[PDB]
Amino acid sequence: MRTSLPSPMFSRNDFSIWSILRKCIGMELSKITMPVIFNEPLSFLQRLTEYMEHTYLIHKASSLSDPVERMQCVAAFAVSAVASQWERTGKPFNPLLGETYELVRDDLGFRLISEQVSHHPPISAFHAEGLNNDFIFHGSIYPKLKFWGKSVEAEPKGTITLELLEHNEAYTWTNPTCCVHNIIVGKLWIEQYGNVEIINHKTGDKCVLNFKPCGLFGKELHKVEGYIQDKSKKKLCALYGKWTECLYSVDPATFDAYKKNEMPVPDSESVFIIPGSVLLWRIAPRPPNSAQMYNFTSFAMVLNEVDKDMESVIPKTDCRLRPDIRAMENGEIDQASEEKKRLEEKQRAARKNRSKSEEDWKTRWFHQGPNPYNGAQDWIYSGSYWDRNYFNLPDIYL
Amino acid sequence: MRTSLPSPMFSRNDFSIWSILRKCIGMELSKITMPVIFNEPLSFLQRLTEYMEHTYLIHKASSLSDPVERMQCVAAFAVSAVASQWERTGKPFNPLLGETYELVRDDLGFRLISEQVSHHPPISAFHAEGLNNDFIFHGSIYPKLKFWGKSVEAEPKGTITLELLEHNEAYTWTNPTCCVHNIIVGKLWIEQYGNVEIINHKTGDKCVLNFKPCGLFGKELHKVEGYIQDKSKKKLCALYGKWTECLYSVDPATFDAYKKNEMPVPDSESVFIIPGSVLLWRIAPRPPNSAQMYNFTSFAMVLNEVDKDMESVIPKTDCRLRPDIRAMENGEIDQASEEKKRLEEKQRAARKNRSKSEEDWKTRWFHQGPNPYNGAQDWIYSGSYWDRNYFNLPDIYL
Ligand SMILES: CC(C)CCC[C@@H](C)[C@H]1CC[C@H]2[C@@H]3CC=C4C[C@@H](O)CC[C@]4(C)[C@H]3CC[C@]12C
Ligand SMILES: CC(C)CCC[C@@H](C)[C@H]1CC[C@H]2[C@@H]3CC=C4C[C@@H](O)CC[C@]4(C)[C@H]3CC[C@]12C
């Protein structure tokens, strides 16, 4: 009768249920495919393209001669870029290595190209341009996940850069942390909080934006408060609002005068417009079909539209061609699950094939390089994507 | 430009991360395979066979003429049956529908047969017999999972029945709830708590066993306290101990006299033997290779041993023949993952094949019927398994 096992056990070190959930919920490679019922029919690259919904704020900024007024607009845009998150608790599809997404919005005067440049760590790079060459807006996002209590925090790591070309100025910042409450059981809902600093690298103007956490009682749900100061640290403007609604500007004096007087969703009031304030930005109302369509904005509903004409110009990596997202969008959930499993296995096989073949992954449209304004490691658009002439691109779809 | 999606979203109702985890951690069918690194190399059927480790308590009970002394032994056995759980935080493999497991321990004087009789809900039935026909011990277990805070509770649902055949008496009870703390992140550890009532259906004797929860401070970790009373509700014996260590008996008077005077594991003291107590049961010390071998008992190390002679008698459904458990036991984790995925897909295909074919699943060795002593719905051993002569058994392994 045996008195022992023929081999000792394997030491799993720190690996936990959280480890599995982290890879699954986040954008890391995961051996377990996230079930399609938790998805929304967008790639993560398309989800990030929603940064561009209020690009009119950038065109407005470019048209103004006063740098402090420009900073108001850039602060408005920074807040507007993250504003569409409320109730977007569907997970966008984990992009495949080498997946790309492009968007041309003639009516909004920009185009954008994005690529999934890595899974170690998962980084999504993007590069947007004003069609009349008034701006460049780029960055890259690695969503770093932590688990607290009943919640997951996604920290969007990477530098955000806005170049107003007519003024020879760049602005940089980082985005606030995004919080997903009730991640295991209960009603999913979303918070954003954190301290954002926008730096004008030509003038030394700085904008401080505090995305307030809830606070006990929840009085501060979604609140944004901050100010613009000049190179001398003199406060020039007070900015206040809610990232889910609006951003306003007011004289710092006037603001301080007025200022003296299962986790559930707290009741948040649309805050009062301090008299004399200037309106900088208000969110677009969500359309009437939004609640039946993953709580998408009207802007987000356009992201994955494809037509035959589009199919003749976009590269084979564009996620409009990703068949599992297409099937989910059309109401074919079992087809979506089926294709998703296929796509993820094909990508695992190709990675193993690259390992045994000794060859390295080549990102097609971005390269690593220092951010020219703050020195940070960055992913920089390499050019040429919009020339078309696509030669020997990754084969990632079925 | 499209203003809507071509199909409305799908309503997922109450489905959550917990829903996925419940199926995965528990014994339900799950589309997501639990990763082998969370397993221990045993089937759930083998894990339950550890109920039998201290069968000598049943032989002792059978040999005694006083029914109250018999009840002490049966209470000892009931506690002993669940005693091997401490630090067994590896998940036993989810049995396949129609999977079976047998154990003959000549040195311990019993044999046991078990079958996975259903996944809706997941029920594991078992039937053990004294080799000299002094007892029958049977039951069935559906592990019902709930998620509280940082913990999962597995409630082992089903009636437990012990028939002492020489005395024409049966005993029934239910097992305590098993708690897995730090289920998402941190160090996994195990508690059992709940109120167990053992009923002698010939005499009306009743044994009350309280498995105490922790309690704030954790003074009560693993403590068992209870008593035996007769049909007249007169208290006859006090029983006390820890399910991780021992069970003792003492005069109820003497006991009450003495009685006046990330979640971490609390410090628990081996409780003091009240003088005059009688020793009923003590746990076997875990062997020196235990901590390198999934914290198995010596008893558990025998469960999955197979030899060529065994392979000529056991049916093709015996989980000694299950290749993924075999591969994990041998240190072949990637082979184990590979075979596990295969086995689970083969079982999903066969279920779909049974659906389109209109035909129903037939359990081979148990049938449904009322428990003869309490009326509850039960799974009853049908006989004939030990005749061998296996004809047209399920084909469930690769
Ligand atoms: C599986 C289910 C339960 C979890 C769903 C998690 C979703 C809601 C999480 C996972 C990744 C998260 C994103 C990570 C990065 C960013 C960029 C940031 O600037 C805005 C928020 C945004 C876009 C997050 C929104 C919420 C997000 C999409
Ligand atoms: C995936 C990891 C993190 C979770 C591991 C869960 C394990 C430890 C759980 C899942 C099912 C549980 C079992 C369910 C039923 C019983 C019968 C009961 O009378 C004794 C405890 C016992 C045997 C439980 C022990 C712990 C158990 C095996």
Numbering used by the authors:
A (entry chain A), B (entry chain A): 533 to 793, 815 to 951
From the paper:
Members of the OSBP/ORP family vary in length: the short ORPs contain primarily a conserved OSBP-related domain (ORD) that can bind and transfer lipids such as sterols, PIPs or phosphatidylserine (PS), whereas the long ones often possess additional functional domains for ligand binding and/or membrane targeting. Here, while we cannot rule out its cholesterol sensor function, our structural, biochemical and cell biological data suggest that ORP1L is a bona fide cholesterol transporter. Here, our results suggest that ORP1 is a unique sensor of lysosomal PI-bisphosphates, and that PI(4,5)P2/PI(3,4)P2 allosterically regulates cholesterol transport by ORP1.
The most striking feature is that their N-terminal loops (residues 514–546) and lid regions (547–565) adopt different open conformations, distinct from the closed conformations observed in yeast Osh structures. Therefore, the open conformations of ORP1-ORD may represent certain important states when ORP1 exerts physiological functions (see below). The 2Fo-Fc map revealed continuous electron density for cholesterol, which binds deeply into the central tunnel in the core. In the 2.6 Å structure, the 3-hydroxyl group of cholesterol forms direct or water-mediated hydrogen bonds with Tyr583 and Gln724 at the bottom of the binding tunnel. The rigid, fused four-ring backbone and the hydrocarbon tail tightly bind to multiple hydrophobic residues at the tunnel wall. The hydrocarbon tail of cholesterol also forms hydrophobic contacts with Ile557 and Met559 in the lid region, as well as Ile549 from the lid of a symmetry-related molecule. Consistently, structural analyses of the open cholesterol-bound ORP1-ORD revealed domain swapping between symmetry-related molecules, effectively generating dimers or trimers. We thus constructed a model of ORP1-ORD monomer based on the 2.6 Å cholesterol-bound structure and performed molecular dynamics (MD) simulation. Significantly, the lid moves toward the tunnel entrance within 20 ns, and the monomeric ORP1-ORD conformations throughout the remaining simulation are similar to the crystal structures of closed Osh proteins.
